[PDB]
């Protein structure tokens with residue numbers, strides 16, 4: 209089988225829509241070679257897309273897995289409700305359960321794979337729905353404990369803490385949504401997000417000030433995306449209603465919301481415990497989420513697998529041939 213990465217609107221996959229929990233959920237369906245072992249749900253992050261697994265989906269299809277990878281809430285052909293409560297990691301965990309059970313049955317079981325914000329989803333979905341996650345893994349994103357207190361992110365960086373998150377302030381703010389609308393800003397925006405730099409090495413994104421709008425006129429075509437996926441990321445992001453990034457940025461506007469759900473579970477609900485197999489693929493140059501943040505991840509697992517790729521936050525495509533190698537071998541022994 210052709211195990212190369214997925215090309216834009218690749219014929220080796222199905223582009224299907226399925227209504228779940230009130231919204232339309234676009235997804236890609238990558239189907240196995242021969243009789244499937246399992247079904248795998250792949251979850252991207254910000255500002256990624258189901259297409260962000262181009263190196264993984266065909267590889268997992270070639271391993272005999274049925275692969276579904278949905279565009280999440282706010283991204284591409286999936287709906288973006290106005291309700292902030294729909295972008296909480298809980299409700300979206302409830303989404304992934306319904307989309308899974310839409311494919312393997314209510315008693316079925318799934319190998320869950322997420323990354324970035326989707327990396328935080330698949331742990332939540334493994335926490336909320338352990339009836340279903342036979343094996344869960346996350347790339348770049350390590351487990352964060354259930355939130356017990358809510359602090360506005362402004363107050364946390366005002367005391368010098370969590371400065372690696374100071375970009376969500378502006379992101380959650382009106383700036384990125386108001387300034388990046390239409391194919392033209394989105395295109396330059398994606399040059400920025402995927403490693404673009406300007407004539408004097410200005411970066412379109414930094415973890416402290418987020419999107420830099422003054423550089424994005426000057427920023428070149430990206431090292432981690434050819435022209436056709438950059439134009440595929442923009443053709444697909446234009447699917448959302450202007451301002452097209454309300455949904456994609458909405459994943460950052462739910463700090464207090466997720467707090468209320470997890471303060472509930474940190475006090476009443478069960479503790480953060482994973483008794484199903486788990487892989488964690490850290491990316492070395494993930495300037496967004498450093499591999500030190502993984503820290504005391506392992507004290508929450510019966511059987512956790514550690515891994516690390518010398519790569520940026522965009523580990524699915526940069527280190528894709530090394531990531532596919534890592535997930536495959538872990539999947540092979542985790543399921544036996």
Ligand SMILES: O=C(Nc1ccc(OC(F)(F)F)cc1)N1CCC(Cc2cnc3ccccc3c2)CC1
Pocket residue numbers: 253254255324325328349352401402413496497521
């Ligand atoms: O913003 C994120 N990723 C990202 C950042 C910058 C990017 O631009 C580029 F990297 F390309 F330059 C691209 C993606 N997140 C991904 C992981 C989420 C999981 C999470 C949730 N809550 C937490 C609460 C307390 C402690 C840790 C927590 C971690 C956070 C947001």
